[PDB]
Amino acid sequence: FAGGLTGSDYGGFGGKYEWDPVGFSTRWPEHLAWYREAELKHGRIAMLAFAGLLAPDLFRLPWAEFQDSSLDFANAHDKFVAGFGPMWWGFIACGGIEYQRFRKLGLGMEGLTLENAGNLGWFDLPKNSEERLFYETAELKNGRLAMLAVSGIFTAGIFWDQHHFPFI
Amino acid sequence: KIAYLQDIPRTIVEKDALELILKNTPKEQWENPPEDSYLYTVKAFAEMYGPGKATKMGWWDYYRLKMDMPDTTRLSSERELQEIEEYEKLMMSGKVPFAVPGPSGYFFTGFVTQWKGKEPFAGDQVITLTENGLFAKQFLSALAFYREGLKPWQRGLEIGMAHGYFLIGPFTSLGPLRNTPEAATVGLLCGCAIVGIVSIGGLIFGSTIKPTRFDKDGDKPGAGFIEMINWHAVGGLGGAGFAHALITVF
Amino acid sequence: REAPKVLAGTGGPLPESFWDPAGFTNNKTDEELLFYRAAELKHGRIAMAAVVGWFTNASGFHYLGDLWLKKPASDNPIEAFNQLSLLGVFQMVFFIGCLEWLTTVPCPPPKDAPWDVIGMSDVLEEDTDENPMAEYKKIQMQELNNSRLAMVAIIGLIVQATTTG
Amino acid sequence: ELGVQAPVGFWDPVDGNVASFRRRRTVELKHGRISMLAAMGYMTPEITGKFPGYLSPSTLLKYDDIPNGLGAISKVPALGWAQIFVYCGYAELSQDQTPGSPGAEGNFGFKVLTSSDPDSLEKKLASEIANGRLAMMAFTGMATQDGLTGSAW
Amino acid sequence: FESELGVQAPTGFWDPLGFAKDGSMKAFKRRRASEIKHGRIAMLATMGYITPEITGKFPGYLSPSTLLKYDDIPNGLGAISKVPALGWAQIFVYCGYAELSQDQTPGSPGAEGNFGFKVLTSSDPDSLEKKLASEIANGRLAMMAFTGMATQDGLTGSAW
Ligand code: CLA
Ligand code: CLA
Numbered sequence: 016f017a018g019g020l021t022g023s024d025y026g027g028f029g030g031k032y033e034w035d036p037v038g039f040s041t042r043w044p045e046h047l048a049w050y051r052e053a054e055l056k057h058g059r060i061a062m063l064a065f066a067g068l069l070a071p072d073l074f075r076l077p078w079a080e081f082q083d084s085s086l087d088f089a090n091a092h093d094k095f096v097a098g099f100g101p102m103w104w105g106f107i108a109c110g111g112i113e114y115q116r117f118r119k120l121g122l123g124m125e126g127l128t129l130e131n132a133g134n135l136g137w138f139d140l141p142k143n144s145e146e147r148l149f150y151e152t153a154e155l156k157n158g159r160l161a162m163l164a165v166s167g168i169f170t171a172g173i174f175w176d177q178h179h180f181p182f183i
Numbered sequence: 184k185i186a187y188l189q190d191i192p193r194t195i196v197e198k199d200a201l202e203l204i205l206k207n208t209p210k211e212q213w214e215n216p217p218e219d220s221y222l223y224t225v226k227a228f229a230e231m232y233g234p235g236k237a238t239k240m241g242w243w244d245y246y247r248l249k250m251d252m253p254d255t256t257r258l259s260s261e262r263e264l265q266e267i268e269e270y271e272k273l274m275m276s277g278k279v280p281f282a283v284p285g286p287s288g289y290f291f292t293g294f295v296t297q298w299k300g301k302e303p304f305a306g307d308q309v310i311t312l313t314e315n316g317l318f319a320k321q322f323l324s325a326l327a328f329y330r331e332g333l334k335p336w337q338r339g340l341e342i343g344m345a346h347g348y349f350l351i352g353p354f355t356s357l358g359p360l361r362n363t364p365e366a367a368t369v370g371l372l373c374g375c376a377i378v379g380i381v382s383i384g385g386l387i388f389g390s391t392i393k394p395t396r397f398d399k400d401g402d403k404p405g406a407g408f409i410e411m412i413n414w415h416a417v418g419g420l421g422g423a424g425f426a427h428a429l430i431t432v433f
Numbered sequence: 434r435e436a437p438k439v440l441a442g443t444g445g446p447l448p449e450s451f452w453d454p455a456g457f458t459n460n461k462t463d464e465e466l467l468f469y470r471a472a473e474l475k476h477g478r479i480a481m482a483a484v485v486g487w488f489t490n491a492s493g494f495h496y497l498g499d500l501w502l503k504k505p506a507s508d509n510p511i512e513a514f515n516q517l518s519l520l521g522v523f524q525m526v527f528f529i530g531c532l533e534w535l536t537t538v539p540c541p542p543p544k545d546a547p548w549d550v551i552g553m554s555d556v557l558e559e560d561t562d563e564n565p566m567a568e569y570k571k572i573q574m575q576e577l578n579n580s581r582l583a584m585v586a587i588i589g590l591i592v593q594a595t596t597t598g
Numbered sequence: 599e600l601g602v603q604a605p606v607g608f609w610d611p612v613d614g615n616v617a618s619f620r621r622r623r624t625v626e627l628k629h630g631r632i633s634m635l636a637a638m639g640y641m642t643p644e645i646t647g648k649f650p651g652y653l654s655p656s657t658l659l660k661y662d663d664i665p666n667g668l669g670a671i672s673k674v675p676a677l678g679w680a681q682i683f684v685y686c687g688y689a690e691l692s693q694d695q696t697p698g699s700p701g702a703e704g705n706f707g708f709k710v711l712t713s714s715d716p717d718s719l720e721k722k723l724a725s726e727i728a729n730g731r732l733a734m735m736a737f738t739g740m741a742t743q744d745g746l747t748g749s750a751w
Numbered sequence: 752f753e754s755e756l757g758v759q760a761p762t763g764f765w766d767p768l769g770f771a772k773d774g775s776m777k778a779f780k781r782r783r784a785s786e787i788k789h790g791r792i793a794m795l796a797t798m799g800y801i802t803p804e805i806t807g808k809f810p811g812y813l814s815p816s817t818l819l820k821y822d823d824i825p826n827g828l829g830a831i832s833k834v835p836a837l838g839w840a841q842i843f844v845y846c847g848y849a850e851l852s853q854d855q856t857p858g859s860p861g862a863e864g865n866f867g868f869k870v871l872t873s874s875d876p877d878s879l880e881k882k883l884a885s886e887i888a889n890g891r892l893a894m895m896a897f898t899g900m901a902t903q904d905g906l907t908g909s910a911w
């Protein structure tokens with residue numbers, strides 16, 4: 016199921032889950048590299064997003080334009096981008112990192128396969144070979160959860176007008 | 184293999200859809216699909232359009248063909264075919280997947296009650312829970328009419344006590360004299376009258392039909408039934424009187 | 434397990450997980466384990482009706498008891514029990530006493546399945562292989578799992594009512 | 599084997615068997631885990647503050663109003679500690695010692711030992727139990743401090 | 752059954768009401784398990800009244816939220832309404848486990864009073880019957896002592 020990708024296996028009371036109840040993997044097997052790459056990159060950003068909304072509430076960056084109150088998660092976007100602003104500082108940074116991914120897998124991402132997907136090569140904590148399998152599932156399980164978490168955060172916080180960690 | 188099922192263009196019908204058709208269609212019908220069967224249209228067209236044949240169609244002809252073929256969703260899958268092939272097997276084997284009527288419909292209870300009785304051709308031996316279950320059998324057998332070891336007068340006495348005790352109520356309440364100071368002796372008299380009337384009917388039955396299932400060996404035919412009916416009359420009197428006594432005292 | 438195999442594949446969170454985190458079943462004989470289940474199902478079946486009876490009475494539907502007391506009884510089922518006329522309670526006990534007598538002495542359930550108070554075992558199959566039937570084990574799970582939930586649910590209702598209203 | 603340590607031997611001036619030691623080992627590890635959770639658990643309402651917040655039952659947006667080492671109560675978070683007590687039982691009745699075939703193994707749900715860093719047996723199994731013993735004395739000593747010698751720090 | 756740990760000396764097989772003319776062999780152990788459990792509770796119960804009388808009430812707070820210095824709770828009946836229902840629930844829970852532990856089901860090692868305390872395990876010096884019989888005999892004394900103590904605390908009004 017989905018090549019040798021680690022989304023299933025070590026996945027709860029059952030050893031393997033293999034949740035693909037639309038067949039987006041069997042129907043499009045050439046994109047399992049793309050799907051993993053997207054699934055992982057979604058998880059990492061969502062995890063930074065959720066851990067994002069909380070930390071500005073305590074510390075603020077020394078940019079001295081972000082050093083202002085009332086910049087909650089419903090107005091920080093439309094406020095910083097100016098007539099340019101901090102949001103472009105972040106976007107340029109994300110361009111620098113994303114350009115690195117292009118070099119490793121070629122321009123058309125031809126080198127992207129079902130084993131190198133979502134593997135930028137930053138190996139500091141992991142050890143051994145089975146832990147990498149265990150950590151890869153621990154990555155996704157956290158990542159998939161935060162993707163739904165920040166989804167609930169953004170919708171509930173702006174609908175019910177919470178804008179803070181309880182988001183209720 | 185079959186000629187027209189080989190090298191059929193995907194444009195005529197897709198591979199998975201064709202396999203689903205072949206699975207749904209019985210094996211004996213592949214060679215010559217009957218008529219009005221999607222496989223019949225597949226044969227009638229794949230023998231006209233293909234690699235060695237007409238490779239093009241008018242847009243309207245292809246449009247009509249695409250509306251004659253299955254759309255990959257109107258065909259039963261393997262599990263559904265298994266459901267049917269096993270449900271029919273159960274039904275023909277004399278076992279019924281037990282279901283219970285509900286709000287215009289029935290819920291399947293997930294139980295296989297063996298349906299045909301010991302005499303499979305007998306219509307009244309089809310065993311059901313309410314008559315052939317363990318509780319139902321033991322309840323019917325333990326009734327006064329059927330209980331083992333009871334003398335006929337005992338069955339009559341028990342049935343009569345039940346009837347006489349019950350029959351007082353409908354008269355002493357909501358009766359013609361329901362609001363009179365007595366209002367219960369009238370009910371007692373009416374209940375005793377009903378008991379006597381049904382006892383007379385039972386005597387008619389025992390002197391005309393003459394059931395012999397309660398007679399002991401070597402006795403006047405129907406004597407057991409007559410004794411049961413007489414003691415039903417006695418028990419009805421007793422039960423009516425006891426109900427009246429309870430009503431008056433309490 | 435050996436003897437707990439007679440009540441195997443019928444409990445736990447998932448259907449085939451013998452939970453017993455107290456050893457209450459080990460060293461116990463097959464008949465004792467069957468009798469323990471007969472106690473479990475009987476408690477659960479009453480608990481299911483108890484919870485349903487609690488809710489149809491805590492919402493405002495106590496007709497027999499409003500028409501017998503000639504006044505709307507309190508919605509709180511514990512307090513409505515006191516208001517219910519003593520004739521009603523005694524008849525309620527007697528009816529259950531007749532039912533308990535009826536099941537035990539005249540129409541006893543079997544000794545291999547002491548919970549078959551209706552006695553389906555004489556018309557049931559329970560050992561065939563059909564899919565659109567023979568799911569009797571699954572419906573045994575739904576009875577047990579629902580009943581177990583009802584047992585802790587009704588106790589919660591009584592404990593909370595008798596304490597925090 | 600296992601929890602036999604280095605500075606002392608079997609330290610049994612009183613079990614001393616196989617089956618009885620196994621049950622005692624389960625108690626030992628179990629008490630070790632709680633103390634380590636409690637010891638680091640007690641230091642946190644200290645520096646980093648009484649971290650909690652958000653909409654809680656009768657404690658909406660409660661900044662962990664259960665103060666002091668004992669926690670007190672007064673419908674402040676300590677009543678919510680009963681929920682900790684209840685859910686602690688759920689793990690104690692699902693992932694428990696009756697199906698815990700070794701001393702106090704819960705099958706390693708987190709798989710931290712599958713090369714993530716911990717290892718099977720050897721020092722790690724000995725380090726867990728030894729650390730638990732230190733924390734159990736530390737938690738008890740911390741209990742004495744809160745009672746009659748002020749607060750933790 | 753006439754040769755178990757219960758027959759001490761001052762009375763023989765003391766069954767005046769004839770619970771043993773029909774007492775089945777397992778019924779003895781069941782009733783013995785009842786006797787051992789009753790006696791051990793009574794010993795704990797007795798200590799629980801005579802010890803707070805001479806030794807003062809617990810130096811502490813009992814309930815850190817509802818100001819129970821152990822002194823507002825009297826030693827004896829009526830303390831049931833003074834001790835919190837949760838301190839009552841928590842002792843109920845603790846006693847709840849002590850039986851939902853290693854089982855005391857009929858035939859189990861817990862069904863003859865054996866649970867695994869072994870505070871006094873003499874090296875079989877013909878004293879296993881001594882310690883067993885002493886525990887049963889003291890439990891019988893403790894039960895009688897408690898019921899008198901309960902009547903002492905009730906009929907007089909308080910304590911003794
Ligand atoms: C009348 C109560 C009762 C009885 C007799 C049984 C009987 C049985 N259950 Mg069971 N169960 C019950 C209630 C009951 N259950 C409830 C309410 C739940 C929900 C949590 C469960 C959940 C459950 C699971 C998940 C499983 C069983 C299983 C079993 C079988 C194995 C024997 C066993 O576990 O111990 C039998 C003996 C007892 C249960 C003793 C009763 C409890 C004692 C008296 C102490 C409890 C007191 C309690 C702490 C205080 C009361 C208030 C409380 C609500 C807070 C057996 C047939 C297993 C099985 O058959 O699976 C194959 C299994 O896996 N049960
Ligand atoms: C929970 C109480 C309890 C129980 C279950 C037992 C059980 C047993 N005892 Mg025992 N015993 C007890 C209390 C108890 N004892 C007390 C308090 C004493 C001290 C007087 C003794 C003294 C004693 C001796 C000397 C011997 C036994 C023996 C036995 C065993 C066989 C006799 C028998 O069947 O007794 C069954 C016991 C009962 C059924 C208890 C019923 C108690 C009734 C209902 C009330 C008695 C009056 C009571 C004090 C009234 C209190 C007043 C209150 C209402 C205000 C059996 C295991 C014999 C033995 O081991 O043989 C091998 C033996 O030799 N016991």
Ligand code: KC1
Binds near residue numbers: 025027028031032
């Ligand atoms: C109501 C919404 C809902 C939620 C919120 C939810 C949540 C989770 N499900 Mg789930 N689920 C359904 C619905 C929901 N599931 C339904 C309708 C079915 C029947 C088809 C079903 C079945 C399975 C199976 C077979 C598995 C499973 C899993 C997990 C899992 C992972 C936890 C962990 O591994 O980190 C989490 C968080 C795996 C498992 O581990 O369960 C613990 C797995 O094997 N689920």
Ligand SMILES: CC1=C(/C=C/C(C)=C/C=C/C(C)=C/C=C/C=C(C)/C=C/C=C(C)/C=C/C2=C(C)CCCC2(C)C)C(C)(C)CCC1
Binds near residue numbers: 349418422
């Ligand atoms: C509603 C209900 C039901 C039903 C029920 C029923 C059906 C009942 C019936 C009941 C009845 C129906 C009862 C009856 C009873 C009776 C009695 C109790 C009687 C008694 C009698 C007597 C006692 C008599 C005596 C005598 C004689 C014998 C003769 C001489 C004189 C004298 C009087 C001595 C069901 C379950 C379905 C369900 C729901 C509920």
